[PDB]
Amino acid sequence: RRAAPLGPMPNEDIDVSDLERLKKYRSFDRYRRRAEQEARKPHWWRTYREHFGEESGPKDRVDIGLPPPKVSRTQQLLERKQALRELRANVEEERAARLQTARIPLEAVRAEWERTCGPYHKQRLAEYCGLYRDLFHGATFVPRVPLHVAYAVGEDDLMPVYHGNEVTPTEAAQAPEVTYEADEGSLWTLLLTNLDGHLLEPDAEYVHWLVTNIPGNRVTEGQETCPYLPPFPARGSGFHRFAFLLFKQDKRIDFSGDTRPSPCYQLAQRTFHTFDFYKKHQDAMTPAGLAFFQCRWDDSVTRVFHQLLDMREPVFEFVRPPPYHPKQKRFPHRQPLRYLDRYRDSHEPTYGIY
Amino acid sequence: SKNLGGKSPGKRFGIKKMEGHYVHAGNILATQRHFRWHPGAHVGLGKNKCLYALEEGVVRYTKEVYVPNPSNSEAVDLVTRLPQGAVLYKTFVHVVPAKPEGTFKLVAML
C-alpha cells in the first residue's frame, strides 16, 4: 500500500535524467553546509528538534526596552567604506598580513563591540542562561546601555562582572562599583537579584542590593531601598545566578510597600518577584542594562549564614536516582550467581530463628 | 543433489521497540544485518550493528539528514558524486530521557 506524501519531498526538485549536465559539489564542506542549511527547516515529518525540545519553535517575544539608536545607514556605510579604503591603501599592513605578524587592539575591539553589537550578544547569552525565562517569563529586552560592574578585592585588585562570569562570595562580599554613561537629566534604578537560592519558594528570588532614584551616573547619592547583602549559596546546590538589572525611569517614583529596613536580615522580607515588581512600576521603568554572573559556595558563605542571617548552614548533595531492576523471578534462567545480590536489602547476614 | 546447505534458521533481525515504548538503559532497541536504522541521540551502536538505548526514556523514530564521517571513503565519494541539490536522508532512532539527572536533597543543616 502506498500513501501520498504530506508536502514536498526533499529531492523531488532536481531532474533525474541527464545527470552529467547537472553541476555537482565536490567538497565535503559544501555538502556539510547544505545539510546543516536543510536541517534547520521546519519539515513536515517527525524531526529531531520536535522530539528533543526546540522550545515551542517560534515565539513572539514581547520587547520591553528602549528604541534602537537611529543611525543614518547611507552615511554610516560611506564612512565605513572610506575607513576600509584608507586601511587598504596602507602598504605596511599588507606586509604584516603577508608576513603573518599582525596584532589587534583588543581593548578598542571590545569597546566598539559594546558600542554597536554588544547588546545583542548580551541579550542572546541572557536567553541562553534563562534570565528572561525567570524574570519576566515572556519578555526579552536589548541591553542598550552598557553596565560595568566591578568588585574590589583590595587596594589594587578589581574583579569585573561580565555576562555569565564566575565571581566568588569572597570577591563579592563588598558592594560593587557600577559605571554607565548617562546625562544629568535621567533617573535609574539598580537591582541585584539572586535567581537561585530561595529555600522555600522555587518561583521566587532574592534581593541583594536595590537602589532607586539614581541621578545620572551617581549611584551612591541615590537612595538604597535594600542594603547590600553578600551572596550566600548552598554548599551542595552551587552556581547560582546573580543579575544586576538597570532600569531607566521618567518620574520620581516613591514606594512604601517595597521599602526595606536597614538590617534587612529577614529572608521572609527578602523574597522578590521581578514580574510583579515590573507590573507595579511598568509605567515609568524600562530595563536598559543587564549583567549576570555565576556564584558558587566557598568558606565565606558560612560567615554570612551564621553571623548575619542567624541560621545554620544548609548542606545539600546531588543524589542520583536508584538503579532500575526488573521484577525478581522465582526461577531466574541463565542469570549469574550475583542475581540475588541485586535485590539484597543489606550486606548483613540475617538469621531468622537461629 | 546439486543445491546443498540452503537450510539456515532466521536470525530474528528486526525492530524490537517501537515509538512511544518506555525503555531503560541497555535495552536493545533494534538489531540488523545491514544499516537500516541509524542510532541518533542516546542510542549506542554495537559491533554487530545493533542499537541499544543509553538512557531511560521514550523511543522515537525520525527522518534526518546524513552527514557521514570524512574518514569513510565510500560515503565521502558518494557525497562528492551527489548532485548540487541532493541531500542524503536516513531514519534514526532516538531516546528522549524522561528521568531527570538528579535532585538536590538536604543532607545536614550545619
Partner: peptide, 21 residues
C-alpha cells in the same frame, strides 16, 4: 515504511549513476 507518507525519503541511488556514434 512503505505505507507511510515518508516512504522513499532515503532514495539516493537514482541521484548518482555509477554501476560513440
Amino acid at each position: 515504511y512503505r505505507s507511510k507518507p515518508t516512504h522513499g525519503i532515503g532514495r539516493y541511488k537514482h541521484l548518482v549513476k555509477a554501476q560513440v556514434r
